[PDB]
């Protein structure tokens, strides 16, 4: 298994949701860049593996789940079974982390990417270790019901450059925003 990473788009006001979907329309580049970004595996001959709550699964268009390309776990306890289209169930974010090292995913797994809600977020930024926040800043206030948690610039160094990340401001739909990448290691 390789790197832990977190992937987010974040409103200023913090929105990460409102009512089981995104708080702005529809970005098609950013979206592309969540694919691009969750998808790409330097490593011969395996894939990244991506950890999400329950209703994050669910707020996937089911026309795009499981995300193709990608080994998709989704974290619940009181699911008895993955969901149709899911690849594995866990019970806590210890325990998927840990099924990385288990003979049937440790030679497949490259990157594992958390792409959230809100708790598994918070809990992963407080993992130990080495860990990378991809974050997307949607640069408006937009009205939401679920929120990132905190991201203490203490410990977590906001990159000067990243191979790959685009560093100017995009824009779509009207909609400004940019791309970060920041690193702690503890
Ligand atoms: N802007 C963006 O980048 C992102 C936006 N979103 C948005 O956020 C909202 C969904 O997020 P949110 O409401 O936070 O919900 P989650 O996706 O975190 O789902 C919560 C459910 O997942 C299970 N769960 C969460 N964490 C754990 C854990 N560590 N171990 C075991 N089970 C866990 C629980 O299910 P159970 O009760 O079955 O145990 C819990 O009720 C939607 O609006 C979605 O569109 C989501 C991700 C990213
Ligand atoms: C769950 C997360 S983490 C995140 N991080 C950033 N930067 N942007 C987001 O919007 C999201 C989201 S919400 C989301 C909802 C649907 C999809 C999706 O349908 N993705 C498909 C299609 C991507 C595409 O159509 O461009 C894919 O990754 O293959 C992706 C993210």
Redesign the pocket.
């Known amino acids: 298994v390789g790197s832990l990473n977190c992937?987010?788009?974040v409103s200023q006001n913090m929105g990460?949701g409102k009512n089981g979907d995104?708080p702005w329309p529809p970005?098609?580049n950013?979206?592309?860049?969540?694919?691009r970004?969750?998808?790409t595996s330097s490593v011969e001959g395996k894939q990244n593996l991506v950890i999400?709550g329950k209703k994050?699964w669910f707020?996937?268009?089911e026309k795009?789940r499981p995300?193709?390309?990608?080994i998709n776990l989704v974290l619940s306890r009181e699911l008895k079974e993955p969901p149709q289209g899911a690849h594995f169930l866990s019970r806590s974010l210890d325990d998927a982390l840990k099924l990385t090292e288990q003979p049937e995913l440790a030679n497949k797994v490259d990157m594992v990417w958390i792409?959230?809600?809100s708790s598994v977020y918070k809990e992963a930024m407080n993992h130990p270790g080495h860990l990378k926040l991809?974050?997307?800043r949607i640069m408006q206030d937009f009205e939401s019901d679920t929120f990132f948690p905190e991201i203490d610039l203490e410990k977590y160094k906001l990159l000067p450059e990243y191979p790959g990340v685009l560093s100017d401001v995009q824009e779509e739909k009207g909609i400004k925003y940019k791309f970060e990448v920041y690193e702690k290691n503890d």
Request: proline share 3%; no cysteine.
């Open positions: 992937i987010v788009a990460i995104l970005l098609r950013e979206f592309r860049y969540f694919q970004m969750t998808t999400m994050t707020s996937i268009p795009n995300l193709k390309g990608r792409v959230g809600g991809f974050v997307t």
